[PDB]
Nucleic acid binder design. Structure first.
Ligand SMILES: [Ca+2]
Ligand SMILES: [Ca+2]
Ligand SMILES: [Ca+2]
Lengths: 161, 161
DNA sequence: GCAGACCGTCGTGAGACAGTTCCG
DNA sequence: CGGAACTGTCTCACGACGGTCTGC
């Protein structure tokens, strides 16, 4: 199992070369709510240092998928899905600093999702948090994300709310 | 005073957004050997996230120099001197992964300096290590540093050895 | 004659997503 | 269907040093 010093190290590496984000994919095949919520944490590093990513990979119980080369000489290690993020994250949050807020919003999105997936009014409250995770990852001078406002006018126009 | 999980985080954060390096400063006013060897670890981060640097700073015993803006919207925190690094680095080495080697090599130079100060031949063995550190922070395809090849040239020209 | 600390910076290595296609 | 898994990219935020410059 994950040692406290192994969790702190990864917490610290993630704060620096890693990313905790969230997005909304347009799914043409979905029924009422035509969007998938994707939640992830990643580690980015030049392709030569690849073995170091693999090591962490092993420490986190081989969860997620490694990639030797995105296609620009960079390697990444990506972990999406609430299953893995509901077991990994809580082991890191206590040690995370810069991206602690992010991590806690993700966790929050996870526990609200089972009731929001077939209910437009709740899905909208969930998407509002999606917008917070994204803004937290932006400069103060950058344009804020607008997922909620665009889904609100789409849910009304569709008579879903 | 540093807890094992506090060190592990800093080693993690250092491997991510930090630097472990060494260099030769040309010093015209120095007598026999006119170079200063400089040993430093640094942390780099965008201007708005300065307060996280500070926490680390207070956590390491307030050693080094905080800097709110290098002048390009970026903030850093540098620690020079063998005096600080001989206390901080041994607390990090056991958790360091990506820049571990650089650390060990840096501790090495600290052991050899007292005798290399006034001895050109021993200062030359030291400068090899200064090249090694610099090489370690380069890609395989990059030019390797030449500090030994030119200071041997100098030392023969000047008749110092 | 010593060594700190105080100002700058080129050339990438990252971050934070997006588009498409798989999978039982 | 609904998610897990492959692709691929514009835009900075980093890294790893280099010159002066004090104030002894
Ligand atoms: Ca970072
Ligand atoms: Ca790095
Ligand atoms: Ca970085």
């Amino acid at each position: 199992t994950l040692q406290p010093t192994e969790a702190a190290y990864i917490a610290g590496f993630l704060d620096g070369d890693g990313s905790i984000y969230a997005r909304l994919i347009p799914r043409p095949d979905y029924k009422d709510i035509k969007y998938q919520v994707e939640l992830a944490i990643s580690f980015i590093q030049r392709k030569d240092k690849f073995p170091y990513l693999q090591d962490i990979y092993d420490q986190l119980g081989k969860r997620g998928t490694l990639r030797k080369d995105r296609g620009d000489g960079i390697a990444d290690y990506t972990i999406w899905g609430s299953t893995h993020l509901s077991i990994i994250l809580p082991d890191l949050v206590p040690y995370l600093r810069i991206k602690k807020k992010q991590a806690n919003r993700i966790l929050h999105i996870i526990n609200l999702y089972p009731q929001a997936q077939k209910n437009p009014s709740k899905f909208l409250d969930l998407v509002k948090i999606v917008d917070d995770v994204q803004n937290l990852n932006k400069r103060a001078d950058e344009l804020k994300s607008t997922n909620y406002d665009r889904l609100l006018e789409e849910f009304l126009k569709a008579g879903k709310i």
